[PDB]
Amino acid sequence: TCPFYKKIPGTGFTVDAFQYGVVEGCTAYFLTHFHSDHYAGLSKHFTFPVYCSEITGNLLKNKLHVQEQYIHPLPLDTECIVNGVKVVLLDANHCPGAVMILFYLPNGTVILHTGDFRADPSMERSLLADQKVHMLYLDTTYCSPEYTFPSQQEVIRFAINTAFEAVTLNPHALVVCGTYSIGKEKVFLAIADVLGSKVGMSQEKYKTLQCLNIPEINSLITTDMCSSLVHLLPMMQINFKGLQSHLKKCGGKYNQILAFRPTGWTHSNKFTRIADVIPQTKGNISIYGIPYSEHSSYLEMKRFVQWLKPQKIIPTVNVGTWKSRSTMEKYFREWKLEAGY
Ligand SMILES: O=C(COc1ccccc1)NC1CCCCC1
Numbered sequence: 001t002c003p004f005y006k007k008i009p010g011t012g013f014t015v016d017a018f019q020y021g022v023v024e025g026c027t028a029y030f031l032t033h034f035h036s037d038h039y040a041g042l043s044k045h046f047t048f049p050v051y052c053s054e055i056t057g058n059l060l061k062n063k064l065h066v067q068e069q070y071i072h073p074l075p076l077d078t079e080c081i082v083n084g085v086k087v088v089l090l091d092a093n094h095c096p097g098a099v100m101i102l103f104y105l106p107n108g109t110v111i112l113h114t115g116d117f118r119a120d121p122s123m124e125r126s127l128l129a130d131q132k133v134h135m136l137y138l139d140t141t142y143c144s145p146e147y148t149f150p151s152q153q154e155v156i157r158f159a160i161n162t163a164f165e166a167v168t169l170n171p172h173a174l175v176v177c178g179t180y181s182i183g184k185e186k187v188f189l190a191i192a193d194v195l196g197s198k199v200g201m202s203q204e205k206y207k208t209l210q211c212l213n214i215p216e217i218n219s220l221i222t223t224d225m226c227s228s229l230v231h232l233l234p235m236m237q238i239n240f241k242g243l244q245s246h247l248k249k250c251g252g253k254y255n256q257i258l259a260f261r262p263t264g265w266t267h268s269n270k271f272t273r274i275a276d277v278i279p280q281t282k283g284n285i286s287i288y289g290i291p292y293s294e295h296s297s298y299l300e301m302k303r304f305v306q307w308l309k310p311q312k313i314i315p316t317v318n319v320g321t322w323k324s325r326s327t328m329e330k331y332f333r334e335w336k337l338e339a340g341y
């Protein structure tokens, strides 16, 4: 059964609703981004129209094998008519291909669905600038003031400086970066760039990255592991056992591993600043957890919502408990009273 917060009223549209079978009355299925919780249920035998970004469409075709006849890519920042309704796709500042969707309902109501997003002041100068939004379907992943983390730029500066120092001290060190989905590619691309190397990876991960429209990608990545001193591995292998195993396979080329585990928020963000971050170490292996977020911090979310001044907010994350629903509703009311809308 498809839940209410994935339906768009007054239309035949759903958003990120592929795991409920045939949804009654749905004429077009929107997909905000290529993350498995959101695409859950999509496969090669899907036979209804799917509306999405170009990048998401490339991933649907090549990774899930959805037939081309059902993939409807739309350009960003452009008014489009879908089944008699005006829509706009906006960059979500999440992973590659991720969008927010503006719906202009036939009755005059305007709805914004953020999908997953990392709110930014630049969104205040998007096509949102003009206009009234009556309903906001909001990515509330980190909707509590405890959720603090640095800018993406600060985290990348830390990673580049850490990697460059380690490899300049020991030219026989290998750098390894964990991954389990699209997103956060800047981590491994920025480290490889400072080290003068391509990024080495499996055939499967190479295929995925080839779908993302990254400029000059062929100059940046490779399946030839021997040519590369920055390697990508599944996130599940970023531990002392897994990294020891990997080092054995490298034919005596390296005598040290420096590894990065991009995470979201963790409770060490309540205590330790990015500059003060230290690794876990066992012998010649060191592992850094770095808080590289592709979701809004509490402060970023609050700024966006107080600027947009929506008439009603519908959370799309942390909706499953009464305690988390009540917590979110209290913050929305504070924000409204503070700003006066
Ligand atoms: O209980 C939770 C579960 O996730 C929530 C996320 C947003 C709003 C409400 C809940 N988190 C807590 C972590 C430690 C301190 C802050 C809330």
Ligand code: NI
Residues within 6 Å of the ligand: 033, 035, 094, 116
């Ligand atoms: Ni996501």
